[PDB]
Design a protein around this motif. Structure first.
Motif, PDB file in Angstrom:
ATOM      1  N   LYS B  33      11.734 -35.706 -69.892  1.00 27.20           N
ATOM      2  CA  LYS B  33      11.944 -37.011 -69.480  1.00 27.20           C
ATOM      3  C   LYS B  33      13.495 -37.522 -69.417  1.00 27.20           C
ATOM      4  CE  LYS B  33       8.960 -39.573 -72.084  1.00 27.20           C
ATOM      5  NZ  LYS B  33       8.096 -40.603 -72.333  1.00 27.20           N
ATOM      6  N   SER B  34      14.200 -36.800 -70.501  1.00 28.90           N
ATOM      7  CA  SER B  34      15.638 -37.508 -70.774  1.00 28.90           C
ATOM      8  C   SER B  34      16.604 -36.515 -69.592  1.00 28.90           C
ATOM      9  CB  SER B  34      15.851 -37.037 -72.011  1.00 28.90           C
ATOM     10  OG  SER B  34      15.192 -38.065 -72.945  1.00 28.90           O
ATOM     11  N   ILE B  35      15.940 -35.496 -69.411  1.00 28.13           N
ATOM     12  CA  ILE B  35      16.717 -34.472 -68.380  1.00 28.13           C
ATOM     13  C   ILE B  35      16.419 -35.100 -66.966  1.00 28.13           C
ATOM     14  CG2 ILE B  35      16.639 -32.235 -66.969  1.00 28.13           C
ATOM     15  CD1 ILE B  35      16.327 -31.075 -69.908  1.00 28.13           C
ATOM     16  N   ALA B  36      15.334 -35.433 -66.708  1.00 26.04           N
ATOM     17  CA  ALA B  36      14.897 -36.380 -65.478  1.00 26.04           C
ATOM     18  C   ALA B  36      15.725 -37.357 -65.194  1.00 26.04           C
ATOM     19  CB  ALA B  36      13.374 -36.497 -65.306  1.00 26.04           C
ATOM     20  N   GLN B  37      15.720 -38.449 -66.394  1.00 28.76           N
ATOM     21  CA  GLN B  37      16.625 -39.666 -66.279  1.00 28.76           C
ATOM     22  C   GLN B  37      18.023 -39.141 -65.947  1.00 28.76           C
ATOM     23  OE1 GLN B  37      15.448 -43.126 -66.527  1.00 28.76           O
ATOM     24  NE2 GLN B  37      17.590 -42.851 -65.596  1.00 28.76           N
ATOM     25  N   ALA B 127       8.114 -39.217 -62.684  1.00 29.09           N
ATOM     26  CA  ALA B 127       8.820 -39.947 -61.492  1.00 29.09           C
ATOM     27  C   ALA B 127       9.706 -40.991 -61.751  1.00 29.09           C
ATOM     28  CB  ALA B 127       7.465 -40.545 -60.665  1.00 29.09           C
ATOM     29  N   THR B 128      10.794 -41.072 -60.993  1.00 30.51           N
ATOM     30  CA  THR B 128      11.727 -42.109 -61.330  1.00 30.51           C
ATOM     31  C   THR B 128      12.021 -42.940 -59.861  1.00 30.51           C
ATOM     32  OG1 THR B 128      13.480 -40.754 -60.672  1.00 30.51           O
ATOM     33  CG2 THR B 128      12.699 -41.075 -63.313  1.00 30.51           C
ATOM     34  N   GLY B 140      14.115 -45.097 -52.978  1.00 29.66           N
ATOM     35  CA  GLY B 140      13.230 -43.905 -52.893  1.00 29.66           C
ATOM     36  C   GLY B 140      12.941 -43.609 -54.389  1.00 29.66           C
ATOM     37  N   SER B 141      11.978 -42.686 -54.446  1.00 28.32           N
ATOM     38  CA  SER B 141      11.548 -42.056 -55.677  1.00 28.32           C
ATOM     39  C   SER B 141      11.777 -40.541 -55.700  1.00 28.32           C
ATOM     40  CB  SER B 141      10.190 -42.386 -56.143  1.00 28.32           C
ATOM     41  OG  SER B 141       9.871 -43.764 -55.862  1.00 28.32           O
ATOM     42  N   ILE B 142      12.128 -40.226 -56.940  1.00 29.72           N
ATOM     43  CA  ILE B 142      12.138 -38.774 -57.146  1.00 29.72           C
ATOM     44  C   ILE B 142      11.024 -38.276 -58.081  1.00 29.72           C
ATOM     45  CG2 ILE B 142      13.814 -36.853 -58.160  1.00 29.72           C
ATOM     46  CD1 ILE B 142      15.969 -38.800 -58.125  1.00 29.72           C
ATOM     47  N   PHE B 143      10.318 -36.971 -57.745  1.00 28.25           N
ATOM     48  CA  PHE B 143       9.468 -36.486 -58.458  1.00 28.25           C
ATOM     49  C   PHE B 143      10.037 -35.181 -59.245  1.00 28.25           C
ATOM     50  CE2 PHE B 143       8.735 -34.297 -54.649  1.00 28.25           C
ATOM     51  CZ  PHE B 143       8.367 -32.854 -54.872  1.00 28.25           C
ATOM     52  N   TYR B 144       9.634 -34.879 -60.490  1.00 29.95           N
ATOM     53  CA  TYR B 144      10.005 -33.752 -61.208  1.00 29.95           C
ATOM     54  C   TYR B 144       8.769 -33.182 -61.705  1.00 29.95           C
ATOM     55  CZ  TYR B 144      14.322 -36.131 -61.494  1.00 29.95           C
ATOM     56  OH  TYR B 144      15.446 -36.747 -61.192  1.00 29.95           O
ATOM     57  N   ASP B 145       8.225 -32.079 -61.100  1.00 31.66           N
ATOM     58  CA  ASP B 145       6.734 -31.777 -61.165  1.00 31.66           C
ATOM     59  C   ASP B 145       6.557 -30.632 -62.498  1.00 31.66           C
ATOM     60  OD1 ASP B 145       5.592 -32.919 -59.107  1.00 31.66           O
ATOM     61  OD2 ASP B 145       5.673 -31.077 -57.820  1.00 31.66           O
ATOM     62  N   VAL B 146       5.370 -31.293 -63.034  1.00 25.26           N
ATOM     63  CA  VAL B 146       5.156 -30.617 -64.553  1.00 25.26           C
ATOM     64  C   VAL B 146       3.926 -29.558 -64.447  1.00 25.26           C
ATOM     65  CG1 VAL B 146       4.401 -30.800 -66.981  1.00 25.26           C
ATOM     66  CG2 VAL B 146       6.104 -32.198 -65.766  1.00 25.26           C
TER      67      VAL B 146
END
Lengths: 252, 252
Positions: B33-37, B127-128, B140-146
Motif C-alpha cells: 500500500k505504501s509503495i502504491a501511495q 486502488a487510488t 482518474g484512478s490507478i490500480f495495482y493488481d495483487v
C-alpha cells in the motif's frame, strides 16, 4: 524429567529466535534497499533538482529513512529532503563514505557504520551511484540514511522471555545495531567479550555470569544477527508458562 | 503426562501460527500500500503520460504488483506498465470496480475480490484516486493488481507440521486467498463448512474428520487470517521432535 524438557526448549528457543530475526531483518533491509533503488532509478531518468526534490520528499521516503541527499560530482552541491539539515559550510558530499562507496562499487551498497556529518551519531547508509541515461557517466551519489537505534529497536521486538537481547554485527565483529547506542560501530567484544563470530550456539561468561550466545547470517548483507540469553531466566519464563497453562486448563 | 504436554503445545501452536501470520500479512500488505501511495503521489505531481510510464515501469513496481494502470476520467484512456496486456476493445476503466472504489472512497483502498478483465482470474487491487495538484479535481484512478495465488503462497510459507494450511478471508467470510485457487472470491463455507468467522479456536468437522480452526484479525484491512489444522498430525510431528531431540542429546 520436566527440567530436561524445558532446558531443551530453551536451547531450541535460542536458535529459533536468531534464525527468525535474521529472516525478518533480511526482509526489512531488502525492502528498504528496493525503495532506495526505485528512487534512484527515477532520479536517473530526470535528475533536474525540482524532480529530485519531489521524488525524495514524499512520505514513503521521509518515513523509511532518516534523511536522503543527492550529492553532485560536478560541484559538490546537494539536493536533500530536509530543509532543517545543515552539515556545516565546508561539507563536501564527494569525500563522504557513502559517496565513495557507491562510486567505487558502481551499484547499490550499504556502508559500514560511520559518524553522521550533522548529528555525529553512528549510522549506516544505503548508497547508490547516479548515472545519466545517455552516457552512463557518473553524476554523483545518493545516500539514504538508516538509524541504528531504530534498527536495534526493530530486531528486539521479538519475544525473548525478558531473558536477553538481539543485536546485529558485521562479519568482522563490528557492531551494526545494539540496544545500547554506545556500542554501535564498535567491536562486539566491548559487550560480548568475544571478538569473533562463532555461529554455533555456545556459552559465554559476562560479568562473571553465563549466557547463551548464538548467531545467524543475514541474507543480502555481510551481517549476522546475534542473541545473548540468560538461560536461567528463560527456563523460569517457560516453566511459568507450563504451570499456568495446566492450572488454567483445570478450570476451562 | 507427555500426551498432555504435547496436546497443549499443539493448541498453543494453532494460535501462535494464526497470530504470527496475521502480523506478517499486515506488514507485507501495508508495505505494498505504501509503495502504491508513493507512485500515485509522484503521478499526481506530474501526470504526463511519459512520466507516468517511467514511474510505473520500474522493477520495484513490476515486481511488487501483477500489473499497474492509470485510467483517465476524461476519455477512458489508460497508461499501464505492460505492453502485452490487452483487456479487449471495449474496456473502459471508468466502469471497473477498482476505479469506482477509489473514486468513491477518495483515498487508497483495496478492492473486494473481482475477476480480472484480461485473464479472468480472481484478484484484488490496491486502488487510488488521482487528483491534480492545483484544483484537487479527480483525473482518474490507478490500480495495482495483487495476485491472490501469490498471497496464498506467501502466507503458507509458515511452518505447519504438514498438518494443514493458512488462508485469508474478509470479515463477511468471503475468501481472499486460499491455497486452492478455486475458492478465491467464494464464501469460505465452500471449504470450511462454517459460513461466519468465529475467532475463538474451535473444532470443525470436514469430510467427517475433525480439525482445529482459528482466526486472527489483520490490522489495516477488514481481513482475517485463518488456519485449519489436523491436530493428530501436529501431535505426531511434535512428538517426533521431542523423541529425536532426546536421542540426539544422548550422543551429543
Amino acid at each position: 524429567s520436566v527440567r530436561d524438557e524445558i532446558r531443551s526448549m530453551v536451547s531450541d528457543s535460542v536458535d529459533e529466535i536468531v534464525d527468525g530475526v535474521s529472516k525478518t531483518t533480511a526482509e526489512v533491509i531488502n525492502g528498504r534497499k528496493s525503495i532506495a533503488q526505485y528512487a534512484t532509478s527515477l532520479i536517473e531518468s530526470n535528475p533536474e533538482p525540482d524532480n529530485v526534490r519531489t521524488i525524495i520528499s514524499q512520505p514513503l521516503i521521509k518515513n523509511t529513512f532518516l534523511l536522503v541527499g543527492f550529492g553532485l560530482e560536478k560541484d559538490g552541491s546537494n539536493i536533500n529532503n530536509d530543509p532543517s539539515w545543515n552539515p556545516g559550510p565546508t561539507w563536501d558530499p564527494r569525500v563522504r563514505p557513502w559517496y565513495k562507496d557507491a562510486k567505487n562499487a558502481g551499484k547499490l551498497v550499504i556502508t559500514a557504520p560511520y559518524a553522521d556529518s550533522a548529528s555525529g551519531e553512528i549510522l549506516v547508509s544505503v548508497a547508490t551511484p547516479v548515472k545519466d541515461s545517455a552516457t552512463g557517466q557518473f553524476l554523483g551519489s545518493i545516500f539514504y540514511d538508516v538509524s541504528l537505534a531504530e534498527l536495534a529497536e526493530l530486531v528486539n521486538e521479538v519475544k525473548l522471555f525478558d531473558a536477553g537481547y538481539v543485536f546485529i554485527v558485521s562479519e568482522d565483529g563490528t557492531t551494526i545495531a545494539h540496544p545500547k547506542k554506545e556500542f554501535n560501530g564498535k567491536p562486539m567484544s566491548e559487550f560480548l567479550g568475544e571478538s569473533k563470530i562463532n555461529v554455533d550456539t555456545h556459552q559465554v561468561i559476562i560479568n562473571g555470569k553465563p549466557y547463551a550466545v548464538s548467531f545467524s547470517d543475514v541474507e543480502g548483507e555481510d551481517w549476522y544477527v546475534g542473541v545473548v540469553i540468560d538461560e536461567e531466566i528463560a527456563y523460569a519464563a517457560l516453566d511459568e508458562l507450563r504451570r499456568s497453562t495446566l492450572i488454567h486448563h483445570h478450570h476451562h
